[PDB]
Amino acid sequence: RGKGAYQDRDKPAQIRFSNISAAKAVADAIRTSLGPKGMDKMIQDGKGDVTI
Amino acid sequence: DLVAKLRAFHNEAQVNPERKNLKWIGLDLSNGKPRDNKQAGVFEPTIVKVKSLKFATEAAITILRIDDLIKLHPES
Amino acid sequence: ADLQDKEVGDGTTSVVIIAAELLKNADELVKQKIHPTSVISGYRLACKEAVRYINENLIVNTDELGRDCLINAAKTS
Numbered sequence: 001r002g003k004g005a006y007q008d009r010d011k012p013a014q015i016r017f018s019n020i021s022a023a024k025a026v027a028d029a030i031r032t033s034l035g036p037k038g039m040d041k042m043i044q045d046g047k048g049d050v051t052i
Numbered sequence: 053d054l055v056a057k058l059r060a061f062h063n064e065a066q067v068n069p070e071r072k073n074l075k076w077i078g079l080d081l082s083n084g085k086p087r088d089n090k091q092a093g094v095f096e097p098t099i100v101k102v103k104s105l106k107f108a109t110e111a112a113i114t115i116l117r118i119d120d121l122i123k124l125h126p127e128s
Numbered sequence: 129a130d131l132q133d134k135e136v137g138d139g140t141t142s143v144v145i146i147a148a149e150l151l152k153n154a155d156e157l158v159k160q161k162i163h164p165t166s167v168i169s170g171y172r173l174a175c176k177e178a179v180r181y182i183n184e185n186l187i188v189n190t191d192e193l194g195r196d197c198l199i200n201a202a203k204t205s
C-alpha cells in the first residue's frame with residue numbers, strides 16, 4: 001500500500017479554508033446581537049441612509 | 053449651592069407632610085435664590101414636561117441600544 | 129427637537145438637553161459593566177413613575193386661577 005494519492009493541487013484546500021474563514025467571520029460579527037441580552041447595530045449605507 | 057438649596061427644599065417638602073406647599077419652590081434667576089414659583093407666576097403646561105420626558109427617554113433608549121456601527125464607503 | 133416642536137411647540141431645548149444627559153449617564157453606567165438592557169428598563173420605569181408623580185402631585189388646575197394663569201404662562205413663554 002504505502003502512500004496514497006499525492007494530491008498535488010493545493011488550491012482546493014485554500015479555497016475551502018477561505019470560505020470557512022469568511023463564514024466564521026460573518027458569524028462572529030453577528031454573534032453579539034443574539035438573545036434577550038443582545039444589542040442592535042447601526043448600519044450607514046453609501047447613500048448615507050441609517051438603519052438600526 | 054442653588055441646586056443644593058432647591059433639592060433641600062424639595063426633600064423637606066417630600067418628607068414633611070406639613071410642608072407640602074414647598075413643592076412649588078423653583079429658581080429665581082434675577083436674584084439667584086429659591087422662590088415659590090406658583091405665586092411668582094412661572095407656569096408651564098404639564099404636557100410640555102410629560103412629552104419632553106417621554107421623548108427624551110425614548111431617544112436615549114434608541115441611542116443606547118447601539119453597540120456596533122458599520123459605515124459603508126460611498127460607491128463614488 | 130423637531131418632533132417636540134411639532135407635537136407640543138415648547139420646551140425644544142429642554143428635551144434635547146435632558147436626552148443628552150440621560151444618554152451620557154446611561155453610558156457611564158454601561159462603562160461600569162452594567163448591561164444596557166438593565167439601564168433601559170430602569171429608564172423606562174423611572175419615566176413612567178416620573179409621569180405618574182407629576183400627574184398626581186405637581187399639577188395646578190387652571191380653573192383655580194383664571195385668566196391670570198394664561199397670562200403668567202404666556203409671559204413665562
Ligand SMILES: Nc1ncnc2c1ncn2[C@@H]1O[C@H](COP(=O)(O)OP(=O)(O)O)[C@@H](O)[C@H]1O
Nearest residue numbers: 079080081094096137138139140141142204205
Ligand atoms: N421667569 C422665570 N423664572 C425662572 N425660570 C423661568 C422663567 N421663565 C422660564 N423659566 C424656565 O426656563 C426654562 C427654559 O425655557 P426656554 O428654554 O425658554 O424654553 P424652550 O426650551 O422651549 O426654549 C424653562 O424650563 C422654564 O421653567
Ligand SMILES: [Mg+2]
Nearest residue numbers: 138139140205
Ligand atoms: Mg420655551
